[PDB]
Amino acid sequence: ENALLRYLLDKD
Amino acid sequence: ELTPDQQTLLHFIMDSYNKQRMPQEITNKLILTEMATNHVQVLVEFTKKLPGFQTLDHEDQIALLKGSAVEAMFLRSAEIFNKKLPLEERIRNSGISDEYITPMFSFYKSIGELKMTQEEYALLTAIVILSPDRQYIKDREAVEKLQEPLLDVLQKLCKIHQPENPQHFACLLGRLTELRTFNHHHAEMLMSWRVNDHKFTPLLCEIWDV
Numbered sequence: 693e694n695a696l697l698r699y700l701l702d703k704d
Numbered sequence: 705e706l707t708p709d710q711q712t713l714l715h716f717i718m719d720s721y722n723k724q725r726m727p728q729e730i731t732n733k734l735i736l737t738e739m740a741t742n743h744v745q746v747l748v749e750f751t752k753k754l755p756g757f758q759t760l761d762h763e764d765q766i767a768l769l770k771g772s773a774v775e776a777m778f779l780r781s782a783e784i785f786n787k788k789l790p791l792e793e794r795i796r797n798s799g800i801s802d803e804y805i806t807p808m809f810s811f812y813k814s815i816g817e818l819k820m821t822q823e824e825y826a827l828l829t830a831i832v833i834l835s836p837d838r839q840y841i842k843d844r845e846a847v848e849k850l851q852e853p854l855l856d857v858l859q860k861l862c863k864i865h866q867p868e869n870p871q872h873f874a875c876l877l878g879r880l881t882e883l884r885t886f887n888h889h890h891a892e893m894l895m896s897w898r899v900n901d902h903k904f905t906p907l908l909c910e911i912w913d914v
């Protein structure tokens with residue numbers, strides 16, 4: 693899904 | 705040699721590279737999942753901080769990340785378990801086909817032998833990350849644009865640590881290139897361990913595309 697990766701990137 | 709925006713850049717990278725670190729467990733050598741998971745966590749944190757990465761297309765960003773992973777992990781493993789054990793592995797016993805083990809350790813020993821400084825590791829990782837060559841990138845140039853400055857700085861600090869041997873920089877990219885070629889066997893290597901009912905964390909499936 694790459695969704696955890698997505699959260700981890702845009703996360704502040 | 706190194707100036708003036710090329711000091712602000714190295715600094716800024718060293719800064720980011722250094723504020724993620726492997727705690728505690730570089731001691732007790734299952735746990736292999738923790739290590740793997742630590743590696744990724746740290747990688748994305750380093751990745752996202754990298755100059756310009758904010759601006760990159762999202763689908764490129766993820767691609768850049770998934771492709772860089774196997775090399776970064778070899779690189780970040782090395783920078784730790786060659787310094788912190790100044791061999792011994794758990795991976796035979798983890799039920800990996802020996803086909804893949806003896807090869808993939810050549811690559812590990814090879815990297816340690818380069819004997820890189822921690823500015824070399826840091827910058828090289830960054831180059832590895834922002835490789836425009838990776839699969840499913842669309843804006844290869846936009847990636848390529850961010851990689852140029854890191855390259856031409858790394859270049860110089862190979863002439864600095866050290867001049868003696870002038871094939872150092874070339875020899876650094878070489879080993880990484882050598883490793884890129886292993887990436888399709890690493891896929892299989894992993895899909896080999898996932899046959900016997902053994903599973904990965906959701907994160908580790910995402911990073912390795914499982």
Ligand SMILES: C[C@H]1C(=O)CC[C@@]2(C)[C@H]3CC=C4[C@H]5CC(C)(C)CC[C@@]5(C(=O)O)CC[C@@]4(C)[C@@]3(C)CC[C@@H]12
Nearest residue numbers: 734736737740743773774777778781795798812897
């Ligand atoms: C046994 C299996 C596991 O349980 C989950 C983690 C995983 C997939 C993983 C954990 C750590 C490494 C590192 C081990 C070394 C050999 C140090 C090099 C980097 C390397 C990496 O993280 O990319 C390569 C293999 C893997 C990915 C490898 C194959 C070793 C055992 C392996």
